[PDB]
Structure 1
Amino acid sequence: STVHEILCKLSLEGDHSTPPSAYGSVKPYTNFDAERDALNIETAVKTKGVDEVTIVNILTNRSNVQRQDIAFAYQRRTKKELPSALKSALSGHLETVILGLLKTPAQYDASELKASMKGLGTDEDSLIEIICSRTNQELQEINRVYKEMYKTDLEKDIISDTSGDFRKLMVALAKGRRAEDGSVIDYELIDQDARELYDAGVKRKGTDVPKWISIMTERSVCHLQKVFERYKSYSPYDMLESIKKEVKGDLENAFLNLVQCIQNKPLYFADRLYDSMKGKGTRDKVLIRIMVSRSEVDMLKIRSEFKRKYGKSLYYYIQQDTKGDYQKALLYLCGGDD
């Protein structure tokens, strides 16, 4: 029946389920009550002036699945979308954060991608980030959600907003077909691949790009880590440096990003986070995106790397470059200092 069709889509939680990810700084609330949270939130938004402190305190303190529970209980009581309430109730950088926290990981990345590709000049960095960083599983969920929301393939949007070997590189990566190379180590292949990167690379006048795309999209991370090392027995420059000498533009931007993620991903974000705060003022768009998307994945390692390299903790840097509940939100998302 159509009672079975609705019956197919549901379940409940409270021990559920098992996405721990110790590398996340955001853990589900212990004693969680979705209804009582939706309640207080509704109470907080109706307060003249908008008690923010409550809303921020609750949402940055609940896990993503929890937020999803909270948001549904809210539409149940109020007959209105929580996402729409907060977009009205909040403003500035704090709104951008809470609204990003209110999305599923896939939905967030999907919406971020769409935002970048709107227009002639894309917002280029953000596209590259997600793409280069996301795993095969993360990426295919982005492909699902992106279709559901925008009634189009993500591939086609990339094709419209990109040209040349850039488009080539982005379409290939976004396919999320990379290998896993779990146990057996392929030494000739490692060596073969190193030689190819060199042969299409520094060795040759100009560059043979698709050759680089194939290896760096297809091969597994581990295999590439080892490839990038063996690479050095061929070229005077390491992989990162060769890219700078071989190519330029957004192609260069992309390959550089992709290589770091493969080599060390948490360090990659650590660096991007440092870069977002280092000058006069800050780049908030990048700072928020990372803090929202890595909060449940690698944040603990990003922290480790961030301190090892820069000497001071991510927490310290957030305090210093952000003030207000916006800051407190980032800090909750960060989880503590090192």
Structure 2
Amino acid sequence: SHMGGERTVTIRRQTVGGFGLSIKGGAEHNIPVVVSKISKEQRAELSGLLFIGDAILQINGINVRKCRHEEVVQVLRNAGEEVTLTVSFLKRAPGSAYGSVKAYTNFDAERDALNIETAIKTKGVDEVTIVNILTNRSNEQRQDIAFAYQRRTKKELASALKSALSGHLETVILGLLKTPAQYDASELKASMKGLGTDEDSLIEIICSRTNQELQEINRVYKEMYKTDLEKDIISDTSGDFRKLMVALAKGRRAEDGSVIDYELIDQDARDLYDAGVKRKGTDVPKWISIMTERSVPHLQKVFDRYKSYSPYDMLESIRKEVKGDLENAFLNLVQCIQNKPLYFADRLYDSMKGKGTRDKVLIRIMVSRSEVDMLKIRSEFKRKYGKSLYYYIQQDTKGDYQKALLYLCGGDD
């Protein structure tokens, strides 16, 4: 569920055939008319302007959104040699194949809102019903339940659930109610609000989020707090640690190119070697520029080619070269590039391995990754440590707070 930004594109008609575009859809099927195929002649002309998936909403200023299929065809037929198209890219931004939380098929936001309202109204609060619902609904479904709750009760859902839930259970439920950008931005402000900084949390978010995720994060951070994320990062960091975080937080990393640039993979690997292990000291800006700007699939091969030049891998080299917040930052970044699910499985184990529980990290990883790569986090938590992530959550938490985390885990092993 996602409609892109509108764009005006002018096309031309070929002598053999026509505009060179196949279309499908219409108001009969409750779907817009979308370009399905682009011919090789008009492929080079419309490179970057029109793509398969664009929904033609206006033709020469005529709104063809609520129109049928053959009605839109006849408009393109009876047009001149050129047509100006207003298009909007239809994508499928919600969803992931490796999330543990599955979409509830018999979903009804009005019924779930009423069942939660009666669960809040029950004396002592029926937290079990609230947990069994919100932990088995996708984030997009939770927003619908919040809108249905306020529609029926004239009261915000998150404010009523804060009055009904307490402890770590409240933190889990209230975290699931925020959108991914809302939740990531709220956790970022928490790492910087005050006179100190939770570098462990600031590093975890900035190093692991992708370009698309960081774009919406920077947007909602300015909307919720009236300050750009880059300013607060600058105010809370310093030195080369500030440089690495501000650069990573831009989300302007190169997209994975269609070619495997072998010459750049060897040159980048040798550059990292010459900038650290080979020389006295470290060329920190060279390490920053390479690991922040290149794509992840490129840097994965770079780090393997780096094992050809250095007797220590990138992680071991980072330990021997830099220290403190800069070292920890680079270590988290390389883990996210090499194997991001293993990065999270390692952080989950560290949050529970000792006395007590670092609940701040356990909750955030279970909330933010339940619909991204939790299935991959689980498969490697079991592989490395011998027992399931379910087993560790079972041993480290109790009560309804345990039940919610095990729901976000999604199963044993």
Whose relative contact order is higher, 1 or 2, with alpha carbons under 8 Å and at least 6 apart? 1
* Residue number among 166, 182, 198 corresponding to 2:241 in the alignment: 166
Q: CA 1:53–1:258 in 2, change beyond 3 Å: closer, same or farther?
A: same
TM superposition outliers: structure 1 runs of 4+ over 4 Å? 3-13
- 1:7, CA displacement in angstroms? 28
- C-alpha spacing 1:67/1:10, structure 2 compared with 1 (3 Å): farther
State the superposition RMSD in angstroms.
5.5
CA displacement at 1:99 relative to structure 2: 0.4
Shift of 1:180: 2.0
Q: 116-125 vs 128-137, which deviates more?
A: 116-125
Structure 2 distance, partners of 1:10, 1:329, is 58
Residues 45 and 12 from structure 1, CA distance in 2 versus in 1: closer, same or farther, beyond 3 angstroms?
farther
Deviation of the 1:35 alpha carbon? 0.7
CA displacement, residues 179-207 of structure 1 (integer Å, 9 cap, x when unaligned):
12243101111111111111111111111
1:175 match: secondary structure: coil
The alpha-carbon deviation at position 87 of structure 1 amounts to 1.1
**How far has the Cα of 1:298 moved from its partner?**
0.1
Unaligned runs of 5+ in 2: 1-71, 83-93
1:102-121 superposed Cα distances (whole Å, 9 cap, x missing partner): 00000000000000001232
Among 61, 65, 81, the residue aligned to 1:12:
81
Provide structure 1 residue ranges, at least 5 long, that are not aligned to the other structure.
14-18
Give per-residue Cα distances to partners, 1:277-309, cap 9 Å, x unaligned. Answer: 111221111000000000000000001111111
Label 1:7 to 1:278 Cα distance change in 2 as closer, same or farther (>3 A): farther
TM-score, with structure 2 as normaliser:
0.77
Q: Take 1:262 and 1:215, find their aligned partners in 2: how far apart are those partners? A: 12
Corresponding residue to 1:108 among 180, 183, 186: 183
Cα offsets for 1:73-99 (capped at 9, x unmatched): 111111111111111111110000000
1:5 Cα deviation from its structure 2 partner: 31
TM-score between both structures, scaled by the size of structure 1 = 0.93
Question: Cα offset for 1:249?
Answer: 0.7
Instruction: For residue 62 of structure 1, report the CA deviation from its aligned partner.
Output: 0.7
| Separation in 2, partners of 1:9, 1:263 | 55
Shift of residue 10, structure 1, vs aligned partner: 32
Call closer, same or farther: CA 1:58–1:208 in 2, change over 3 Å. same
Deviation at 1:235, TM superposition (A): 1.2
SS at match of 1:264: helix
Q: Answer yes or no: is 1:88 the counterpart of 2:163.
A: yes
Distance 2:225 2:111 in 1: 33
- Cα gap change, 1:259 to 1:8, in 2 (>3 Å): farther
Q: Which residue of 2 aligns with 1:16?
A: none
Q: Which structure has greater strand proportion?
A: 2
**Are residues 1:79 and 2:154 paired?**
yes
Cα deviation digits, residues 257-285 of structure 1 (max 9, x gap): 00000000000000000111111221111
Shift of 1:40: 1.2
Shift of 1:58: 0.8
> In the aligned structure 2, how far is the partner of 1:337 from the partner of 1:181?
34
Deviation at 1:12, TM superposition (A): 38
Could you say which structure has the larger radius of gyration? 2
Distance 1:197 1:152, change over 3 A: same
